Amino acid sequence: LNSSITNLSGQLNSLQSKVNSLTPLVYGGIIAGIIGLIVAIVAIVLVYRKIS
Amino acid sequence: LNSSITNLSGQLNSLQSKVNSLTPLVYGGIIAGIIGLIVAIVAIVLVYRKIS
């Protein structure tokens, strides 16, 4: 049982490590999709005002 | 073995808050990035359309 729990705590620790190595990666990654949305939007706007 | 179980549960609960604050936010980030990509691709065509 003891071996079972030790390895188990171990896997949790480990998956928190995947998610916390992921933490700055997924934030930067959100931050690139959101600037993409806004920079795309401000460029469409500026082309759309002069075609219309 | 008891104290280790209570700590496992604690750490699990922490990490479940973490990933449940991730999964919507990361979806929203991904939604914003694909939409930004739509807007940008449609901007490409409209600058291409208006020079022609």
Residue numbers in the entry:
A (entry chain X), B (entry chain B): 424 to 475
Sentences from the paper on this structure:
Surface layers (S-layers) are resilient two-dimensional protein lattices that encapsulate many bacteria and most archaea. In archaea, S-layers usually form the only structural component of the cell wall and thus act as the final frontier between the cell and its environment. Sulfolobus acidocaldarius is a hyperthermophilic and acidophilic Crenarchaeon and thrives in acidic thermal soils and hot springs worldwide. The Sulfolobales S-layer lattice stands out from others because it is a two-component lattice, consisting of the S-layer-forming SlaA and the membrane anchor SlaB.
By combining SPA and STA with structural predictions, we built a complete S. acidocaldarius S-layer model. The Alphafold predictions of the SlaB trimer superimposed remarkably well into the corresponding densities visible in our STA map at low threshold values, and flexible fitting using Namdinator further improved the fit. In the assembled lattice, SlaB trimers occupy alternating triangular pores around each hexagonal pore. The SlaB trimer has a tripod-like structure, with its long axis perpendicular to the planes formed by the membrane and SlaA. Three Ig-like domains branch away from the trimer’s symmetry axis and face the SlaA canopy, whereas three α-helices form a coiled coil, which at the predicted transmembrane region insert into the resolved exosome membrane. The lattice is a ~35-nm-thick macromolecular assembly, in which each SlaB trimer interacts with three SlaA dimers. This interaction may be mediated by the positively charged D6 dimerising domains of SlaA and the negatively charged N-terminal Ig-like D3 domains of SlaB. The new data confirm the overall p3 S-layer lattice symmetry, in which the unit cell contains one SlaB trimer and three SlaA dimers (SlaB3/3SlaA2). Because each SlaB monomer interacts with the dimerisation domains of SlaA dimers, the SlaB trimer occupancy of all triangular pores would likely be unfavourable due to steric hindrance.
